[PDB]
Structure 1
């Protein structure tokens, strides 16, 4: 059975091809103690990975080895893959082909190191790197559509028509979930809440996932939040302190549609999706308008599909049918699509075998993987 490992900037989702859900989902973090150990005879490790790092984060410095879809610390990235194979899935990676994922328009050295580490460190028999948005279209059972995938590091749009990708129409924004977490940390200082440490950034991320939503009309929502407390929500911190937030609930996700909130010059996710459709041939735009697929954890805000539909309807001609497909399990669409792809019989010759790697080096990944 093939292994499907979806390494996003924030989460590692791993499991077996053929299953309908990942067997292991844990934060893609490595934590190291920032204090001195005074207790002799206690099992204190040098570093912690995943859920252990998250539960001990009070005395750790948390580090993400992946930033904006790009591995910035390959030693910590090996710790996460080792944790994935031996502690989470409890398999020997030298017996299973591994399907990995990547965002488009990434540095070429990123997937070359992924290939080298899989074959030389873990000794995988076969290996493949797929594009994340392409896998989301597999999960939706479609061959035509434009996928807007947004996770913790990258937001990218890939239009596909009749199984053919339009690479010149692929767009990528380095604005995603981690930028929204940092923006929420900033605007929480307006109410006197101070979150600064890496452990406190994990608390703000949990606040964002529980209380934030996308407003259908931002200016009308700002006027509603300024006239009453009907939008205020409370949240209990780990130490029992209760914080209350109002318009920050929808101002944080609003940066997806107005990146100028972050000082960015780029277009919002609605204009990025529309611009990607407009870079495609005129004869396929109607089918892309009707098959706009949302994917990733940053698309899980309540109200984001209705807002995307409203914004793209305003940009597109009035005779086009704008249909935003936001399945309830779209947080795992990339993994589910990879599980489908790695199980296809027509895919079993697409693997990069160990023999091909031995006779071509890590640059084989550029010839065999899109």
Structure 2
């Protein structure tokens, strides 16, 4: 292998992952946001939750990555200083950099802002940019339908023979952060509670709301149908003599008030149902904004035979993302299988690593040849600067 060590940085819209290419896990996972506390001042890092709990006026949380998965506040992003100084503890000038979403091709202005940050400001020697869905897939698949369910929403990316099909790239608007909103709005009356108030929203999202989500389930089949069925069955057990699974209760200790919150299994299934049938919150969302219909992306892949691309993609489905860990892959599969009955689906997923699979992808910086990736040097920048 090569005599080098890279810094690997992944700026997700929610989490930022950083570490060296020579070890199996990242040195740090910190928030892709910061507190601006006021003489101004900028707080980064997960525990630095301390400041949020202080509940101090003028403290406000701002974000670095828009819903595109792309950095939009570049003065703030230059976070990088914080990473290099306090976490990796190395001059940014020494080592090659590897950083990471699939696009339709237009915003790809970004490359320039990266030159300015990597070169004009940090003095990085050289950097590679990997495309997240592509790297994750490579980290043994050259062709794959990559279904990434993150905080910003679902990102669906067909990748055929190492190439990304940009016009078939599709980004849902409903994911993890959306789930935070719904958990909050729904539980509001039991916990008393029912921008500028960013600090508390953030702190709650990062504490009890995060635990609550980890402890939600996704129903295997359209929930409204599951209900009608379970009812229809329940009637017969009852009538027959003279247990509906949705009546099981789940208990969550809510710490801020030392108070138990109990949901029935249906109410637990309900939250993720919105990702699939978002027409159930507002009348302003079409069923087509739902993850299942969002089929659309494969069919748009077939427009580069089609019943071949369909077959390739569907035998290499990759499910990834923090939110994809919510109990109940099976619904994404059921949802895919019924839009494409003629084909056999085979899906792959890290069963451990998915929360940071994007960073894990970029890491697999351990490719044996310099010719395997485009590596931008200070040169490239100079030459772009000409007319």
**Does the pair score TM above 0.5?**
yes
> Within 5 A, what are the aligned runs for 1:270-349?
270-272=292-294, 274-281=295-302, 282=306, 283-303=308-328, 305-317=329-341, 319-328=342-351, 329-341=353-365, 343-347=367-371
Which secondary structure state, in structure 2, belongs to the residue aligned with residue 56 of structure 1?
helix
What's 2:8 paired with?
4
Which secondary structure state, in structure 2, belongs to the residue aligned with residue 30 of structure 1?
strand
The 3 A distance-change label for structure 1 pair 110 and 362 is: farther
Q: Is 1:257 matched with 2:282?
A: no
What's 1:57 paired with?
52
What's 2:159 paired with?
160
Which secondary structure state, in structure 1, belongs to the residue aligned with residue 275 of structure 2?
coil
Q: Is 1:147–1:293's contact at 8 Å kept on the other side of the alignment?
A: yes
**1:121 Cα deviation from its structure 2 partner:** 1.7
**1:322 Cα deviation from its structure 2 partner:** 1.4
Distance 1:231 1:103 in 2: 41
What's 1:219 paired with?
224
Distance 1:208 1:109 in 2: 39
Distance 2:246 2:8 in 1: 48
> Within 5 A, what are the aligned runs for 1:194-233?
194=193, 197-198=200-201, 199-217=203-221, 218-219=223-224, 230-233=248-251
Distance 1:182 1:233 in 2: 20
Which secondary structure state, in structure 1, belongs to the residue aligned with residue 60 of structure 2?
strand
**1:259 Cα deviation from its structure 2 partner:** 2.2
1:268 aligned to 285, 290, 297, which one? 290
What's 2:118 paired with?
118
Q: Is 2:144–2:316's contact at 8 Å kept on the other side of the alignment?
A: yes
**C-alpha offsets along residues 144-164 of structure 1, whole Å, 9 cap, x if unaligned?**
211012222242212122223
What's 1:367 paired with?
none
What's 2:374 paired with?
350
Identify which range, 329-338 or 226-235, moves more after superposition. Answer: 226-235
**C-alpha offsets along residues 269-311 of structure 1, whole Å, 9 cap, x if unaligned?**
2222x222222232222121111101211211111x1111111
Distance 1:151 1:308 in 2: 14
**1:238 Cα deviation from its structure 2 partner:** 4.2
Distance 2:215 2:192 in 1: 16
What's 1:15 paired with?
19
Which secondary structure state, in structure 2, belongs to the residue aligned with residue 352 of structure 1?
strand
What TM-score do the two structures reach when normalised by structure 2?
0.80
Identify which range, 224-233 or 201-210, moves more after superposition. Answer: 224-233
What's 1:47 paired with?
42
Q: Is 2:102–2:157's contact at 8 Å kept on the other side of the alignment?
A: no
**1:125 Cα deviation from its structure 2 partner:** 0.8
Q: Is 1:31–1:61's contact at 8 Å kept on the other side of the alignment?
A: yes
**1:359 Cα deviation from its structure 2 partner:** 2.6
**C-alpha offsets along residues 164-186 of structure 1, whole Å, 9 cap, x if unaligned?**
32222211223321122112222
Q: Is 2:212–2:252's contact at 8 Å kept on the other side of the alignment?
A: no
What's 1:38 paired with?
none
Distance 1:166 1:93 in 2: 33
Distance 2:357 2:386 in 1: 28
**1:29 Cα deviation from its structure 2 partner:** 2.1
Distance 1:205 1:341 in 2: 35
**1:314 Cα deviation from its structure 2 partner:** 0.9
Distance 1:355 1:294 in 2: 38
What's 2:258 paired with?
240
**1:208 Cα deviation from its structure 2 partner:** 4.1
**1:212 Cα deviation from its structure 2 partner:** 1.5
RMSD, aligned α-carbons: 2.9
Identify which range, 246-255 or 87-96, moves more after superposition. Answer: 246-255
